[PDB]
Amino acid sequence: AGTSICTSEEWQGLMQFTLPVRLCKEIELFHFDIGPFENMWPGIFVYMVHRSCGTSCFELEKLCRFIMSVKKNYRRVPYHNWKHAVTVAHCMYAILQNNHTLFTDLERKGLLIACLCHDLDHRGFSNSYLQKFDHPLAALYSTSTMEQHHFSQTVSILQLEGHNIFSTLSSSEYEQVLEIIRKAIIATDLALYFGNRKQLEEMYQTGSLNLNNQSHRDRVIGLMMTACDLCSVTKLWPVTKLTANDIYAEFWAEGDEMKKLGIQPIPMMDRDKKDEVPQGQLGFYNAVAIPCYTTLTQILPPTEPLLKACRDNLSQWEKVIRGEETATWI
Ligand SMILES: O=[N+]([O-])c1ccc2[nH]cnc2c1
Ligand SMILES: O=[N+]([O-])c1ccc2[nH]cnc2c1
Ligand code: NI
Numbered sequence: 001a002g003t004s005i006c007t008s009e010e011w012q013g014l015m016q017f018t019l020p021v022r023l024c025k026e027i028e029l030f031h032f033d034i035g036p037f038e039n040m041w042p043g044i045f046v047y048m049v050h051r052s053c054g055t056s057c058f059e060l061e062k063l064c065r066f067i068m069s070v071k072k073n074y075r076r077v078p079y080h081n082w083k084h085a086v087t088v089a090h091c092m093y094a095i096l097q098n099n100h101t102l103f104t105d106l107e108r109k110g111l112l113i114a115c116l117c118h119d120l121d122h123r124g125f126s127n128s129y130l131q132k133f134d135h136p137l138a139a140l141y142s143t144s145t146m147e148q149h150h151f152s153q154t155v156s157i158l159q160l161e162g163h164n165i166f167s168t169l170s171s172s173e174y175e176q177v178l179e180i181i182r183k184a185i186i187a188t189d190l191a192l193y194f195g196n197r198k199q200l201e202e203m204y205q206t207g208s209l210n211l212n213n214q215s216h217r218d219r220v221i222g223l224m225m226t227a228c229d230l231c232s233v234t235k236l237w238p239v240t241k242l243t244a245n246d247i248y249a250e251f252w253a254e255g256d257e258m259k260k261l262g263i264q265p266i267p268m269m270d271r272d273k274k275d276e277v278p279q280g281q282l283g284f285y286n287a288v289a290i291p292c293y294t295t296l297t298q299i300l301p302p303t304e305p306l307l308k309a310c311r312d313n314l315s316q317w318e319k320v321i322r323g324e325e326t327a328t329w330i
């Protein structure tokens, strides 16, 4: 109940944090893994905002309050947590850096914030679960149920005293950025991805795609959000495999709850069906990840390293299926 708020110690501590110099160079690369640097994650986000948007984009105090309160409103769930938030924001940073002038100052600031906030207050349950069992959230939010909640949580945090990093925008730009953030968070509903990718693929192939057309921009930003949300599949294989362990930890816990309610879960969420995981991952890469990065690379050529890495990980799941896995640690 209610929106959590960071301590004075938390945000002043972030304000005084300095990132090690060696990491500056690494943070620029798509394949960077934040995993080994947990104490640095909020600082890494500051660095990224400052480098993409400028050190004077946001009031430092308000930015640090905002970031540390965001962290406190992610739950201690296995996957949809603070680590995932920062990972997704880093992918967006890398995309923005490589495509900087295609996006406005307002878009870049909105999108980095949108990524950091896009899974706020996730409870470890899917839209499928919330709607099957008529959680109050599904009554309030008929479609894109959790994503509408994540956006509401974002607005809640911005409304905390001293947390409104967007207050200094003109009334007009303020409305525009909240709309950028809303559309971007809603776009993280994978249900909407399939239609979005199909549309973009067609606009690209026919040559009608036009980034001066707001509806096209929205769709391209949507596909960027998908690419960033799924970016664990673009890391080096050991990182991808460890992250999959966390994703499935969540899935199996939801599946367990469904069993208690008399319903057999999908195999993906069934802890007694772990043998089907490699084929399930193959399915996910073929149906979701590979097409996403394929179309993204067509539209934004600098994003090709994401696709190449995704392809390498597909090959790894294939090796698993053929019985070729080597030693893994968890
Ligand atoms: O390495 N850096 O700390 C670094 C390099 C370039 C930048 N431009 C704006 N902030 C920067 C930080
Ligand atoms: O990294 N992911 O976002 C990711 C990877 C595999 C998945 N399987 C089902 N959902 C997934 C999400
Ligand atoms: Ni989500």
Ligand code: NI
Pocket: 084, 088, 118, 119, 188, 229
């Ligand atoms: Ni997410």
